[PDB]
Amino acid sequence: MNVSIEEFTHFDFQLVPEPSPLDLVITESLKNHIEVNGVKSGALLPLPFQTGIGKTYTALNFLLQQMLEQVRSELKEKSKRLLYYVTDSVDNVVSAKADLLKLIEKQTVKGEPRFTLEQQEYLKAQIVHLPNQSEQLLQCSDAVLNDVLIGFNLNAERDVQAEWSAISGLRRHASNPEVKISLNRQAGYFYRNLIDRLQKKQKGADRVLLSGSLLASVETLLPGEKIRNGSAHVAFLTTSKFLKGFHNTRSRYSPLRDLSGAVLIIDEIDKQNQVILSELCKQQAQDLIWAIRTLRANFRDHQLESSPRYDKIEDLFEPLRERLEEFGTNWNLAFAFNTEGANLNERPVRLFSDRSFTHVSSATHKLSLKSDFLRRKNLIFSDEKKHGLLTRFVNEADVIYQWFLGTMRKAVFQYWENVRGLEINRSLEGTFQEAVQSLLTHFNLQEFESAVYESFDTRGLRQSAANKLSSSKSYHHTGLKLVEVAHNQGTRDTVNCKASFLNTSPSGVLADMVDAGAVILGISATARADTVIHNFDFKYLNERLGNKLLSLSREQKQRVNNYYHSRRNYKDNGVVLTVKYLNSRDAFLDALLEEYKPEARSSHFILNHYLGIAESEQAFVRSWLSKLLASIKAFISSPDNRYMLSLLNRTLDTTRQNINDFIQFCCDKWAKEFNVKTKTFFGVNADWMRLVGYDEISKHLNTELGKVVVFSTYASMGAGKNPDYAVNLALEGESLISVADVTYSTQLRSDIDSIYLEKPTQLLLSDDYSHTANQLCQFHQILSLQENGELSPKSAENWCRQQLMGMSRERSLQQYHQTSDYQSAVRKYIEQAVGRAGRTSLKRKQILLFVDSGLKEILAEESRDPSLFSHEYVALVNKAKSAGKSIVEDRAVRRLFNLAQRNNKDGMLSIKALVHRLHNQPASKSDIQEWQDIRTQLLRYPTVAFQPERFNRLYLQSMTKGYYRYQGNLDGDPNSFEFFDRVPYGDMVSEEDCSLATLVQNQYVRPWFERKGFACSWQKEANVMTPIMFTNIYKGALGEQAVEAVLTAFDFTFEEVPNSIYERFDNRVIFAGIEQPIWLDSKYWKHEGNESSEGYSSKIALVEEEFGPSKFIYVNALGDTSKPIRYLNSCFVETSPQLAKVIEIPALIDDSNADTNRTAVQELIKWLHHS
Amino acid sequence: LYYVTDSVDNVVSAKADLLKLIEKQTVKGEPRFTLEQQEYLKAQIVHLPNQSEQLLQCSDAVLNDVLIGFNLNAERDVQAEWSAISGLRRHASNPEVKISLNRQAGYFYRNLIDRLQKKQKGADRVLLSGSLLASVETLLPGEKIRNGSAHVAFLTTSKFLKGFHNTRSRYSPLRDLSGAVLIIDEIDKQNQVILSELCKQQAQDLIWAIRTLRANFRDHQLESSPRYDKIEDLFEPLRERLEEFGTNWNLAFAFNTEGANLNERPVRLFSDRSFT
Amino acid sequence: LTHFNLQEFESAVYESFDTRGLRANKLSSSKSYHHTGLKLVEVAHNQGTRDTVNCKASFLNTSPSGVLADMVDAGAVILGISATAR
Amino acid sequence: MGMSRERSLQQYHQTSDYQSAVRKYIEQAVGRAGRTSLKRKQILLFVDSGLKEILAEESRDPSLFSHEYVALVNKAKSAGKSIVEDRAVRRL
DNA sequence: CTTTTTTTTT
DNA sequence: TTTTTTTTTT
């Protein structure tokens, strides 16, 4: 029945249901965001309220109001606004879709249904659900497939009909449960093939016309075709499906490329952190040697067409072409690569790079790389003792590869700009595939076609342009890299460098999603958990998004708290939560095992033989099983409780059926002991929940009389399930009591009445996809813990080194158990799991909570504001705290110590790399500007009031307000630095040792400092410079500026130093029309210059060779004015003034009274006249 | 020694006829071969069917022995695939199930042999003997040829042109034909079979291939080791030809058409390469 | 192929060896269709782009009789059994 | 240009290659009744009549044929001889 | 105007 | 020394 919008004309769009406080929480924040940041701006709104308060019901009412607003827009009149509902589990997707359909059906306004049957049918026609391809194929009938095959003329093909006949035959005898497996696999492969040929047919000139039955059948087979043609604009799907996209008749639609204006509702947003991570680690490794040799070979000559379509694109690739020419010249890319020597063949070389300051190599010795022109080979060898290291080559090749992928993204966007004007309503995603194909075909780089596509998929969300001390630096938009250097397959004389990259973290992906223009509603009670492993980094998201990260006011949070406490009034309704912490108590499991099999020798024999548990793992099974039994008995002993849920870490499916039999035996015994009927539901997982619905449990409690025990896990029943059941008053005595103060629900429902919470175990994420994926996931978690501040840079480097050498998973878990991130993840899991018993307002008078005693200390360490917790979590925390006493340790000061060490180490490594790039002549403009920007910034802002977002790595947060203490070798190990209170007799970073006030009392320095805008005082701001920037940059700029100011008053002219002699001397001096060039090397004060006459004489030799004879000035800005002015030759030997090429001045401004050394300047001027 | 014919039925009938000849051949009223001689001679003959048929005739004990002996059990999807295959085996219904079982048996056999070979080529080479050797020789009949246990093969022309598998790689019998004896039965019908294999070759984009050859032969060099002796002199004329062709035809640019009768239908050219 | 950076021809090299693991057009050599073959080239627009073409070429480098003669030249002794062998 | 399979088959039917292929298939198929030395006293062969003219043009040496194929040829040839062009002169 | 089945890997 | 399940394409 074709439903139009003509039946919504008489609909009254201004009559809306009563807005709850949660509805005003979403609406007021979104209307303020629109009225402030603009209509086209994206936003991220986390909603971290109590479990079971009504956040998903409010998100589905918000989705229904968006659908009604869109219908009104089409009535008044454009393309459809896309609404997505995303969560990590399939069960929550289908439950939310059925809840929205129930909302449309059963919503009544003032005693009458809101929507007529035709309005309901249209609204339901606007919602789609996008499952995996096996579920999409298996859920549509044989008539639909035969209609599609006939309409598209595909039964003529032989392979297609053979595969479809096999599918229909296998699915006919689908009663057996092992046919269902290997039917999903073939359904997915057939769906791939059929959609590939359907799209190939639909893209050519022989494009079929779709209407009537063929259209309805292809919209049934391809739900994304409904979205493509504008029939639907609401989609329900999982996070992994959202990250992979779906299919329409034309191509595969990626929602991440078309997020401008979309609305995303991400339920349990924190658990999506790991899901996105699991996708980022699935990327394919690339051979960097082949990739760079191919890029260099195909960029020598190939040219784009001179067409208006390719306007402005050829200028994007010119810098990459010059870079490739110089890289291939420097590293001799005409030859291939092989290793040389011993110990390089037993195990391949593995290299790990943070890409900023963490570099770990598996080689014992630093590996070099030399070119043998006689052998025509590049040899990776180990030396016996510059620009010949393997790490340098690998880092530059990774930079060039990422530069190529970034310039491909820029050229695709420029192509879309040119073709929009040439084609004069085609989207950036519509033309993306044509742009990539045309560019790669023109450059003969079609082998990168896959690499470019996945590049758009992940960090392709990055419309970027960076790893400079002038940008905002973070691990989350930088990533990591793991390179394996091993021999090629088959060959025994060449090696490859297989590199795996993470170009962004999940928090980077979310931030780029908000920057794309999406409005994202993050719904979870743990949306602001203080972990970076099991949640996003919200300190990074706050710093990056700014005011696009919408916040809720104190009044709104008070209204929500009043809303929650007015519907969950436990204290006034006589409801008691009884918490019990259970130990192993093995003296009871031994008796239970004895009564299970009286004929056996002892319980060790029963466990080893009857239950099938090995001797090594018996003790663990002895501890977790007995705790479970101690909870079951206490539930059975309770006369009034009916519903129990036991959340474990492992599924009790048929694989552990022997243990299930033991558990079933024990339950039957207790059923006999108390004369209560009990039913146990084993193996309640995702597959069970899709095959056998959870309503069966709800059916049992509705009809049968007795108790029910459910055995599920955290991974299946811990985040968003509503496990309530319909209440039959005849099956419940005087036990249920309503705890809300004004009834708010139709139908009587009650929730879980007893719960057993095991301690979550495998809290450090893993990846079973491959070995590379698990390596990337482990290095991502170490770098996230170092970037947040939970790990010292020394401990993070030691953990990255043990990870590169192949540490065991138990050692990793032991290292992660030592952080506070682990405790915040444990409390997050406990709070979410305990929130499954708080869904309804019909409560039992007593609710039994049985908790693993291994959680007792952890729950005792909870110290957040208790104004946001649920009642059960407050009961758990109060019980744990009242049980004993714990020593509370501070977490912000350890983070400040770690982040001071981190910032100092990053500044050290970046400064050394930048100076090394400066010393390699010629020096590019970018490096010169970067050096000047650092010196300018540190001169203008030695301290900053707020946390910087441009030079963040130049500053650290200090305990004190304008100074701090430190200890460390500034030319040694950056991992051995100490700060603040750990060193009470260390050095200082302040104004007192600067002598800045002493320096600026000079009559000529002060006007220069005032004109330039340089600070003459250190503002007492908590963000102060790092010791590296204090000593190697700031004081050098202070001395150079003071010397230049003093000399410029004496008619001295200064020029920029040529790029080939940069960083060698401060400035170039021209005075009194002297044709002899003068070179200036200015220092702040005397200190200690370790450069002996060797390095200085080498510098003089280099400058004299470049520019002939010249004079030199070795001047110190500050010092004693009574000291003599000395004359030295190029060999630093004292001689007569007339035969000395270098004159050294001890000082230019006095330090004891701040008086300019006029005599020394006069003598220098006179000697210059003599020169 | 190879026995080749077009049809599978003639292969199995000729193998059973040779085995019957070994069994009941007589010389002057007494059997020619004792039972142990007969068992040795029969052990020298193998039959190489398609991969789905090779896998579907291996019992569950043989395949679990192979998976255990190569540490292939704990490798995720492989066990997922194998668990599915054995399930389809147990409930083999009417041919509706059987077409699917054959397709998945062939795909699983290809994957399993690919990983067995990549394991045998690396430094973690498993030692094969006893039960493990007998099981892998049952799963891979060409492993018997590679070892030297057997030297008589019965197979079809399609299998002979495709080759078979051992633990190391895929053995192509056409590359090692020196000194072999081939018995091709119904040789005339093999004319069409070989033809149907020659037409299966994959098309090549000539513009991409020549632009790649020109880009990569410009500067890249072989090593100056003894193992590459006088190989670069084989490629020098091809490099000079490539540089001259690229200069003449302006291979720095890409190619496009223009005008009528060129867009509506693609252009097809046929060449005998001599005069047609 | 690794030394020349032409690993994208690896499949092409393997199949060519498959067809020609047993081994000119000059009026001075023996000429025949059975050792030279034929070629069919299709010139069409590249898939996805509207401004470049490709020349997809399919070759037959030998006939079945050329394959059989190459087999005998490689050193195989072949017994051809059929009533219609000639 | 894209001719139809029936137009290829029409063009191939005009060659003597087609007739040697037809007679090769017939002789091989008829050779399936000559496997043993225990024979029925009468053997019945029923051949499509649209084959008789083809079988009428056998000209090879009959010393290599089987008995059933010799009888098939003699029966088709019983209508006599039809004028045909020498294959060697046209091949020349 | 002519009028299909066959093997193998995928 | 710690002690798993989940989604999607292939």
Ligand SMILES: Nc1ncnc2c1ncn2[C@@H]1O[C@H](COP(=O)(O)OP(=O)(O)OP(O)(O)=S)[C@@H](O)[C@H]1O
């Ligand atoms: N008028 C109503 N207002 C609020 N909730 C309602 C209302 N009517 C029914 N509900 C149900 O109230 C229960 C509360 O569950 P949700 O609203 O799904 O929970 P939640 O607050 O989102 O907690 P999460 O998702 O587990 S962290 C659900 O069963 C809702 O479907």
Ligand SMILES: [Mg+2]
């Ligand atoms: Mg929810």
